[PDB]
Amino acid sequence: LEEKQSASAPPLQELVDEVQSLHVLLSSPRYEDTPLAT
Amino acid sequence: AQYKFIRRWELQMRDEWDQLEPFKGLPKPKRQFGNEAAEVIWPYALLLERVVKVHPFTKSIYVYYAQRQSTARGKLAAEIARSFAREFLIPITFHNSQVYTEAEMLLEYSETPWVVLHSLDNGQKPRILPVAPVEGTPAHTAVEQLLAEVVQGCEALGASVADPVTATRVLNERPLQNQYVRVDYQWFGDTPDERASHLVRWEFEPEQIEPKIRHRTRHVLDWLNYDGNLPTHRAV
Amino acid sequence: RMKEAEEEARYMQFRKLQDTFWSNRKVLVNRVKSMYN
Amino acid sequence: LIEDDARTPFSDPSKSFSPRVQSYGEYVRLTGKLPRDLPVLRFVLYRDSYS
Amino acid sequence: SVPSAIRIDTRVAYRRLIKVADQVTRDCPLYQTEGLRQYVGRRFLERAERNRQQYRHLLHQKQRVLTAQYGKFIAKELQQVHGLAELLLRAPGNTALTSMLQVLSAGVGNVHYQQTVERNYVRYCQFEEKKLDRDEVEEEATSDRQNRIMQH
Amino acid sequence: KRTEEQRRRVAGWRPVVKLLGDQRLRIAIVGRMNSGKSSLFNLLRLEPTVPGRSNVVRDFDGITRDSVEGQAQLEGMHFTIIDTPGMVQGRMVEEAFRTVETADAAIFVTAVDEDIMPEELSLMQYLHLKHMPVVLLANKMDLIQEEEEEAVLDRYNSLGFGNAIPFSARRKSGLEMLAAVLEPLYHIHAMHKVENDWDIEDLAMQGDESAMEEIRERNCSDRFIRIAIVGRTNSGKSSLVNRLVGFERNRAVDEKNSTRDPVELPCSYKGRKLKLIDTAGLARHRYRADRDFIGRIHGLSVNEIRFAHVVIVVFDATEGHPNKYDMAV
Amino acid sequence: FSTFALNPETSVAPHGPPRGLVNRYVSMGLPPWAAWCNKVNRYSLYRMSGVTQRSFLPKPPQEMDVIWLNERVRERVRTSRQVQNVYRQLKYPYVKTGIHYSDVLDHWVQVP
Amino acid sequence: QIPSIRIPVIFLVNLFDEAKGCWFGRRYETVYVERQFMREELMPQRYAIYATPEAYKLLGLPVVNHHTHEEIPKTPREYEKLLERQRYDEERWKYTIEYLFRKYEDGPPELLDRPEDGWDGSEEIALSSVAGXXXXXXXXXX
Amino acid sequence: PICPGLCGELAAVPFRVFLGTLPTLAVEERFLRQLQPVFAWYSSRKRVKEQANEFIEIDLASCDAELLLRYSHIYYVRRQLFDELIERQMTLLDSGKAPKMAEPSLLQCLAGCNMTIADRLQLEIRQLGAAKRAASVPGRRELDPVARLEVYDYACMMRLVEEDAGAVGDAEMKARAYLPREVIESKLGHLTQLLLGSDARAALDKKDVKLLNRMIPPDYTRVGCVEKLRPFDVTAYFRFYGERINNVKVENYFKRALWGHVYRRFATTPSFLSGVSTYWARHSGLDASFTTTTMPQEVAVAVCDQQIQFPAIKFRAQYVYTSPETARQLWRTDAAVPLMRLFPLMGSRTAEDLAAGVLTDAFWMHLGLSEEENLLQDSLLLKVRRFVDEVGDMYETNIDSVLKRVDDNFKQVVPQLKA
Ligand SMILES: *P(=O)(O)OCC(C)(C)[C@@H](O)C(=O)NCCC(=O)NCCSC(=O)CCCCCCCCC
Ligand SMILES: Nc1nc2c(ncn2[C@@H]2O[C@H](COP(=O)(O)OP(=O)(O)OP(=O)(O)O)[C@@H](O)[C@H]2O)c(=O)[nH]1
Ligand SMILES: Nc1nc2c(ncn2[C@@H]2O[C@H](COP(=O)(O)OP(=O)(O)OP(=O)(O)O)[C@@H](O)[C@H]2O)c(=O)[nH]1
Ligand SMILES: [Mg+2]
Ligand SMILES: [Mg+2]
Ligand code: NA
Ligand code: NA
Hints:
Number of helices of chain E: 5
GO molecular function (chain F): GTP binding
Radius of gyration of chain E: 21 Å
Structural class of chain A: mainly alpha
Radius of gyration of chain A: 20 Å
Distance between the termini of chain E: 74 Å
Number of helices of chain A: 2
Binding site for Mg(2+) 2 (chain F): 238, 259
Keywords (chain F): GTP-binding, Metal-binding, Nucleotide-binding, Signal
Oligomer: part of a larger assembly
Domain G (chain F): 26-140, 226-329
Bound molecules: ligand PM8, guanosine-5'-triphosphate, magnesium ion, sodium ion
Binding site for GTP 1 (chain F): 34-39, 58-59, 62-64, 139, 142, 169-170
């Protein structure tokens, strides 16, 4: 592995990314155990 | 022809035993074209005369030299690299027990042989050093200067490490690498205890030295030929 | 000393479980203060 | 592990031992998940001479 | 290097063999999804390469009369293939044949292990076919003897 | 040490007694020295007739000096398994060469604590020449870690033998998996017996004399006469049983205590089924008290006397008057 | 997991003879395992240190006839099986009458 | 368990063994002979004298100390060690780097090309053999 | 080595070539002694270990087959390779049953070209026959120096005669030492920039990079080693890079082949190779004290003459693949090198390749630019541009107008026998 590796060697996008990530964290059933303050 | 097959197997096994009678448990070295310095039986006297140590943070040392050269200086440098690979490579790994050393003869034209040094850090780039022997310096001092250069390179590579704590930890948890060295223990001893029998060894372990035999007191008394403050029996 | 840090990691989960339970009780008792007042 | 016999000394490699428990283990309460839409819990309480 | 008719016939034979192999895998439980399909493919391709090499060596009116013998040899090989297919189709009923197919699909041991199981499969099927006849005629003989004894 | 003068005499041995031969599946446990061959044989053997008899096992190089055969039972499969001495000095003994050639199959057992020395490569290629069915069984599987199983098992698959079987003789794991591999051979050998049983019956109806005498051997249903040969060490009793069978079946060397596991051999003498059972050399208590392992081997010697039908005690006649301990026997 | 196997994570109390005793023995000259003797005191340690030899000659040095070079009769002790008993036996060297040939005088000469 | 040691001895005359048909030792030659042999047969007939530096000096040969009986072997292993040490002291040139690599001084023998005089065309060998995931798609609005 | 860079997209076709029965690896010893300039590729190739036999897994579709056949020097293994090649080609053609055919009027000129080539055939086969009887020399040693010359050893004999014409020892390796791939790609990008301002691609396609990794012999994969290319590999790479970087449409493959052959001539030119080549350690930054970054002129001239020699055998080997009906005949009767890299480029493609090659070679001989100096001059580049665009347009407009040029240019490039 060593030998082979040495031989080989406010934007709208981010805003909508935050929107999608927050919606996922809110509506996901895996995160249903999130504390109420969070 | 079954008896002939059995005879062939016996002959092959007899040759194998003649080759590795004291060399059964160690692994076999790489069967390359430049690593001929490993399959040969090394004299322990020569290995003791050639004792050289490198920085503890290095893990791999390879040398690459061409088989056929075009220039006179290229032939000289290739001869220097070959002499170094045949003289100082095996002592380095045998006396460091941490580094893996390898030599290679490339079937091409390369007037400048080189040596690569890999440290214990996986993210750190290896150090490459070309063999440029001075024309005025003979082969002996040229090989000596090459050895000094590679030792200084290993020292720099080990001093430029990122995290010495993790370097030392991976050094501790790295297995052995000098298992392939075939050495002939000649008139010096078979086991390190008999080898260093002329020196007091204070580095021991209590649970290791504790014998586990039945009636160990009786056996130790018999071995020491010591009375043990025990009254003699009848003896009359 | 590193094995000692591994012992805390086993019980550190439960100490976090106790804090969040009261944090839920503090935020819920705040909601009923707005509903009834 | 405690010694199993007294006649044989600790020097014998064939010494037999027996395991005896010091603590049966550690236990913690079980706390189920609390729903958000139903935080209010209703229960019945039976008390005998408790204020 | 092989005539088109022979190529078509051997493709039909290999298709039938693969159909029978998958049918066996689905009917009796083969614990691997690949099963004996890969082993059958390897063996058939090896025999195909061997026969093609033999045909290349034989190509050297003598060639015309040898082509007929080679075609008849290939026809016999394909009839043996059909027999193998029928035996595999009847295999799921018997328990030993299923175990043999399972060990051939798993591929444990050396080649001589798999070869002895491969070659002896047809012989074991024929042995089971003859066992019923032998035991039936023996039971009929014993029944006739017992009847003629009861008459005496 | 084999010499042309010695090997010429062995060829002139005439069988005093006829070996019965194997009528069931034969499997030889082939492997290296101290690889768990005897321990694997203990889990597989099942002899309710001689319960005290077992295969000796110890974490030492060269515990099994001589081969031993016995009946084994595994998931309703009746067959016999042969224990073979490990490759000593990187070579097999002559008693083990002729023994593994009689077996139908073989189980190549290898341990993972030590790498594959060039001796197994010689033995594996030796079994390749005989065209014998061999299965690779990786013993001592419990020593390997979970994250290391994929590395070692990829190597055992590259030795020509496909899909090596993981097995642990101590934890008895993989026993139900080794049984499934032997299932086809059991039905195969059962197929060979009945077909050969049909051939020997047609010749009997023809009038062949060699076929009628063979049927009478199978038609003979009598209780076995277990005849054991016991005696003091260095007395020649193992060398005697080799003269009975007609070849060097057991090992017989000048050094004392060359047999460490009793060996049983089914034979037929004048139409009487009998079993010649080798035994280890008995010894006094003042010689076996300090020597613990010899006391265990002597324990297996006295046990075979309790189940032997006819005991034949041998003693060195060159001494003249027999030994005092030989009378106590 | 087996409860009868000692837990490798824990560590039992050290029981064997300590660094002090082992270092004292190895500095006296005996091997480190030699600390496994029986009932040693100051005088027994002085005796087992070997500073003086427990040997002698069959005759006084002025009355010696057989040639002995660096040879002294020794005493080997062997403790019995059970306990507390020992057998002490003397051990004599291998006297072999050498019959050599002298270069100064012709005829050979023999001497024990 | 002391093995049979062989001692060095300086011969004074060309001794020819009649039985085996060879020379025991040339004149002024240092031979490793049996102890009993030298003591009972060679010494009395004055055919050889013990090899010592003073004997070499008296005979005029170049002095050399073989260190006889310096390490009295109590075991064949120690005897082998002593013989190896004596062999080294005799030929230190046997244990140099150039002699250790005399076989590989020209390179790999497999790499070296050797001329062939002849061969039988029927010895050629011609054998043929049989030669037989998923991820996620992440989109970013831009 | 009939055509450097004549590569086509095709599936991998594996084959297990025998190596020897252990422990007597006789053929392996022969390979170690003979395959020295290609031992890097030999070690890079995968090894297959049977129960008691050893096999090398070689891909016939790749350049590995031709590379082994050129340096084989072992008659039985090379004849078995030849037979396997021709048999699998016959089977693939029989299974395809639909090869692309060229225009019949174009194949007539190429058919008439084979008439004048038989004389040069008779001369070059005599050159190949004397090299076969030179096995006793320690340089090149064959197994049978008295056996009759056959069809399969044409590559070995041609390489031996090229070495004898170069008269310098190990010219191929001496050139690979000074020819590294990175600087070659950089200067080839510079050349395609100088030739086409905007009509050149920004880079090479990834599929074509995979194809080139398939068709180029692999070097050592060590940390300090640098990828180095033999002069033949450099010529092939130049031709393929040109013919794949030119932005001519796929329907006008003639212009792409013309660009490829122009690049091939640029590569085979000695002065261009000397100007482009640099030392590998100089490129990597290891050694800079030699100051010898220039390629040896004698070795350059020798390795260029190596590719210059033997045009007739290459022309006939390509005419074999020009038509499949004549391929089945000439594969086992006349001279033919059955390379799998030429089969996917069927009749039309290979005929356009032959036409572009002869036109480019004749234009090269007419200019004589390989004589004076400095192929990188603006006047010469503009002449090349005008030539290639004129030839492409003339081929697209009228077939006979360029067929007459092809005929005269063939007569010019391959001269008739003189005494
Ligand atoms: P394509 O059409 O180009 O391929 C055609 C092939 C088949 C390659 C022919 O060129 C060819 O090789 N033809 C002659 C060979 C032939 O017909 N072979 C038929 C094989 S019969 C046979 O014996 C194979 C049976 C193997 C069965 C294995 C059973 C295993 C069960 C456990
Ligand atoms: N961990 C582990 N040890 C085993 C296993 N099987 C055998 N051993 C050990 O291996 C050692 C030798 O056991 P044996 O059964 O005598 O092996 P053997 O091949 O018959 O030995 P020889 O007759 O001398 O060749 C003993 O310590 C056994 O406990 C196993 O499956 N796992
Ligand atoms: N002189 C002579 N020696 C014999 C004869 N038969 C056997 N021996 C020798 O007796 C010795 C002992 O042989 P074994 O067969 O191993 O005797 P054993 O009783 O099985 O020995 P243990 O297994 O150790 O108990 C060997 O050296 C034999 O060669 C004989 O008939 N005459
Ligand atoms: Mg055993
Ligand atoms: Mg015995
Ligand atoms: Na053992
Ligand atoms: Na004996």
